[PDB]
Design a protein around this ligand. Structure first.
Ligand code: HEM
Ligand code: HEM
Ligand code: HEM
Lengths: 131, 131, 131
């Protein structure tokens, strides 16, 4: 993750943040339309789950200058996800759906370079979580 | 089985399947320690026998939306089992041992919800096989 | 152990190792079928037991150029074995079953010359453990 990529994360976060509730909820709609059996793993109200996911994305942004410091957090997270029945193959699905939902809700406000930076950051977080 | 159970079977199979050889082999070790008398019935290499049992569990997953479609297959397999010396009381022994072995090998990666759904699917298969 | 036998141990271990989880669990199933009386000695989860056995076999391979260096390790392990109820006459049975299980899982992958070598290496380890 280079300096330009860090600043693209911060800039695009300023576009995602004020629309975070909508982007999270669109993400679950899009995810359950693309993989029609994964919704059973979600046992809590989806509005609550969406707040949790968007809070962690905001933590990644907040730590973007030193993702290394987020390694323990992400490891603990990744462990809990195995306990929910989440498997390694779910991560590319979730990443693609999240990035497409951000791109969908913001349109041109989410730039191609910003989406490339988020692809990398998600790929990092997924690697750390899946050990 | 209901829609949530069908989904749990499909999603949990994504963790059981890549570990299916180990889970099968663990299941024969566990079954032979729990009920040493049953081991005489197994006359073929256990490495090949585990492959066959795991192949049928994959078929149950592939067919899980319409287990009725599998009734004739399961009836033929139940008839063959009677030829091997298998009797009705062996089915609950085998289901307990198989479920325990998937729970052992996967630990908390086999969720309580998935275990309940697989418990039900095993019961259905054992019922069809024994008429 | 001569130079050629040492090489055969090292050669066959590159085939055994990637398969070690399955070979160790197949060994328990086969042991418990061949010798139903001994399963009562194995009181911990067999998935964890198999990991422990295959780890020590790795250590025997790692130290194959100087098995005399492993004498203390093997003495300590043999003492533990007495505390688990294991007696000398168990050793040939376990060795036979272990070798037959590696042969079964690898087939053609396990040559006669490699099986002979492992026979000698098992015999050395069992002699040391039984002092
Ligand atoms: C970087 C990727 C991800 C992040 C930041 C993330 C974030 C979160 C967070 C913050 C939680 C709340 C509970 C906890 O902290 O343990 C959660 C729960 C959960 N996540 Fe994720 N997640 C990610 C990937 C995934 C993937 C790939 C899936 C696959 C479907 C998934 C499915 C779930 C499920 C099923 C729950 C539990 C919902 C419940 O309470 O029933 N997550 N996730
Ligand atoms: C849902 C439950 C079961 C499934 C899916 C299943 C599956 C299989 C399959 C696929 C075979 C290969 C031969 C064939 O297709 O006829 C087989 C053979 C066998 N099964 Fe099962 N089985 C089940 C329950 C049982 C039970 C309850 C026992 C009681 C010990 C058992 C004992 C055996 C034996 C002895 C053989 C033959 C081994 C040999 O060839 O010598 N199975 N089983
Ligand atoms: C070269 C031969 C063997 C090796 C490398 C080996 C390795 C081990 C290892 C690493 C352990 C873990 C506990 C510890 O480290 O003290 C162990 C435990 C054990 N071994 Fe062996 N072993 C061998 C032979 C045997 C034989 C001949 C038996 C006879 C049945 C046997 C039965 C057991 C039992 C019952 C335990 C304890 C299981 C428990 O925790 O309940 N092992 N063996």
């Amino acid at each position: 993750i280079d300096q330009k990529e860090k600043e693209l994360i911060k800039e695009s976060w300023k576009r995602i943040e004020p629309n975070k509730n909508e982007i999270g909820l669109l993400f679950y709609a899009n995810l359950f339309k693309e993989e029609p059996t994964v919704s059973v793993l979600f046992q809590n109200p989806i509005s609550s789950q969406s707040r949790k996911l968007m809070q962690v994305l905001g933590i990644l942004v907040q730590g973007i200058d030193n993702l290394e410091g987020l390694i323990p957090t992400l490891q603990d997270l990744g462990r809990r996800h195995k306990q929910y029945g989440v498997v390694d193959s779910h991560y590319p699905l979730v990443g693609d759906c999240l990035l497409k939902s951000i791109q969908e809700y913001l349109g041109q406000g989410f730039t191609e370079e910003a989406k490339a930076a988020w692809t990398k950051v998600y790929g990092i977080a997924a690697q750390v979580m899946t050990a």
